[PDB]
Design a protein around this ligand. Sequence first.
Ligand SMILES: *[C@@H]1CC(=O)N[C@@H](C(C)C)C(=O)N[C@@H](Cc2ccc(O)cc2)C(=O)OC[C@@H]1NC(=O)[C@@H](NC(=O)[C@H](Cc1ccc(O)cc1)NC(=O)C/C=C\CCCCCC)C(C)C
Length: 215
Amino acid sequence: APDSVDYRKKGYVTPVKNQGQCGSCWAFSSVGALEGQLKKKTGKLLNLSPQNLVDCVSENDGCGGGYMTNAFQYVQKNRGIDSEDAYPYVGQEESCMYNPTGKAAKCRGYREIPEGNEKALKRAVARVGPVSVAIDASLTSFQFYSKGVYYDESCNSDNLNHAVLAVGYGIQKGNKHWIIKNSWGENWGNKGYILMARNKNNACGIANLASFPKM
Ligand SMILES: *[C@@H]1CC(=O)N[C@@H](C(C)C)C(=O)N[C@@H](Cc2ccc(O)cc2)C(=O)OC[C@@H]1NC(=O)[C@@H](NC(=O)[C@H](Cc1ccc(O)cc1)NC(=O)C/C=C\CCCCCC)C(C)C
């Protein structure tokens, strides 16, 4: 694989959204992954609907929680996801109003990275595009990230509690990293983004609950 990857520079990645108080992190992660695969296939980028996922993915718990695979599996069986334009984010769990006219992406299926395999996730990101990853984001050191490559020996790989999007990887001051899109708005982190430590004994369990859709 290449040394540098950054799918933001290829137009795959939409702006940094804000989930708010609602714990719809999985939905923002899922949408991020589909958005990437939409641009690759069609040439056109747009915002897909996190609210479509929150309201209609009955196998997940809306703002309470959820998995990305379940949201991808939903878009496959449903034969669509609406645009943000067609179906906008309100910040609560409520009734499904999927309108197949406002369809924007479909999904052929999904794939999962092997558990605790950062090399596999690296190969995935390089070839596919923005990959959905879950992590431990409970630490204070995570909350108030501003610059550099992030790492903390507290970061429990087995306590996976927050879904984000791996949009790339690289190196910065000899610290290999994953380029990560959060959904806590543009004023968190470095413009919404964090660079988390790559090949550092699976830092915050970056490789444990990782997956992508095929479009
Ligand atoms: C999205 C994350 C989010 O918005 N915020 C997280 C913060 C920034 C740490 C967060 O709150 N995450 C957890 C709760 C939590 C907080 C702190 C610690 O130390 C641990 C957990 C959360 O539930 O947030 C919602 C989103 N996260 C997920 O969907 C993730 N899933 C879970 O965290 C987990 C389910 C699970 C994961 C791994 C397992 O092996 C088994 C089960 N959720 C729960 O355990 C909570 C279950 C039910 C809560 C019901 C609340 C009812 C309120 C009325 C996913 C892996 C991406």
